[PDB]
Write a protein that binds this ligand. Structure first.
Ligand SMILES: O=C(O)CNC(=O)C(=O)O
Ligand SMILES: [Mg+2]
Ligand code: NI
Ligand SMILES: [Zn+2]
Length: 331
């Protein structure tokens, strides 16, 4: 079995290997990359996502989210308070202000220590989940707006044609902006490209051990667990590496820098934080190997998780028994 310790693997495809996206994902899996839940892909030196980032400041962040924490430094939830719209140029200036800027630090490890010590005492503002793309239309390789769609994959594998669309999302971050522990909708893959700016630190639990994380989360967030049998779908709970190590939960960590891709694999729980002002683009995707994970994915039916239009068909076809209850949670 390849990668039996479930380490995060880093890949350096050549420009020739960068042509066929599906083939390269299957290659990484042949080497055991999925066992970690997360892999890093460094693009060939010849590749670029676009020519420059000099003209992005007029993108609108219609609903910036202030991420307010509750709990203790290693075990907390966050809720998102909606703020007034602002442009990317306004948000960049805000991120670089004295109130929100990255503190002085020695290295990524020092900054990670400062994040876990101090995150709860601040409320950073995240420009998350903005439909759109920063890939140039002429970029033909690993262009996250030109991937094969999940609907087309389901149709190729299963023969059933379904409604729905699959487009990318932009994330504008600042110091301490946080992504809570989650797997993707329907336990899909994700791919994330860090277009510019400061790094993003990731934590990940191997898919084979995801239920260990879930059991810890039920213990640590007991009211949330009574409310919902899949409350991590709410995407609000944080657990630090120190707490994970104290409870014996297997995980790994890695820092993504600008110009790098990350892939999360089906049922790979992940969480993390941004180091300073940055912009990332991410999208969900599927492969043949996903189908079995989609059929087994948990679902939130309490009403909290509320998701896209396109998840309807995935539930309806892959999980017909759950469909009626889940749809009630959507309505
Ligand atoms: O970058 C973020 O805030 C969160 N991204 C992801 O969870 C992802 O790409 O799957
Ligand atoms: Mg602009
Ligand atoms: Ni994710
Ligand atoms: Zn729920």
């Amino acid at each position: 079995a390849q990668n039996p310790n479930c380490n995060i693997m880093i890949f350096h495809p050549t420009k020739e290997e960068f042509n066929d996206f599906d083939k390269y994902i299957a290659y990484m899996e042949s080497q055991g990359a999925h066992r970690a839940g997360l892999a890093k892909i460094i693009p060939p030196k010849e590749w670029k996502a676009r020519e420059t980032y000099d003209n992005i400041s007029e993108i609108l962040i219609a609903t910036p989210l202030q991420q307010v924490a509750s709990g203790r430094a290693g075990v907390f939830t966050q809720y998102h308070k909606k703020k007034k719209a602002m442009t990317v140029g306004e948000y960049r200036h805000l991120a670089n202000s004295k109130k929100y800027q990255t503190p002085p630090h020695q290295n990524f490890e020092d900054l990670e220590r400062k994040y876990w010590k101090n995150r709860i005492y601040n409320s950073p503002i995240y420009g998350a989940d903005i439909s759109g793309s920063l890939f140039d239309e002429n970029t033909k390789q690993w262009n996250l707006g030109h991937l094969g769609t999940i609907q087309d994959l389901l149709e190729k594998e299963c023969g059933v044609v379904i409604e729905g669309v699959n487009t990318p999302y932009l994330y504008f971050g600042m110091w301490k902006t946080t992504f809570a522990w989650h797997t993707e909708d329907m336990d899909l893959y994700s791919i994330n490209y860090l277009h510019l700016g400061e790094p993003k630190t990731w934590y990940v639990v191997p898919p084979e051990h995801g239920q260990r994380l879930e059991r810890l989360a039920r213990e640590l967030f007991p009211g949330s667990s009574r409310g919902c049998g899949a409350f991590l779908r709410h995407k609000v709970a944080l657990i630090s590496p120190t707490v994970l190590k104290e409870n014996g939960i297997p995980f790994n960590r890695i820092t993504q820098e600008a110009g790098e891709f990350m892939v999360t694999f089906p049922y790979g729980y992940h969480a993390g934080f941004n180091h300073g002002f940055n912009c990332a683009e991410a999208i969900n995707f599927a492969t043949p190997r996903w189908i079995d994970y989609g059929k087994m994915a948990s679902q939130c039916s309490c009403g909290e998780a509320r998701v896209t239009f396109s998840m309807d068909a995935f539930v309806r076809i892959l999980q017909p028994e759950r469909y009626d209850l889940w749809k009630r949670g959507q309505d």
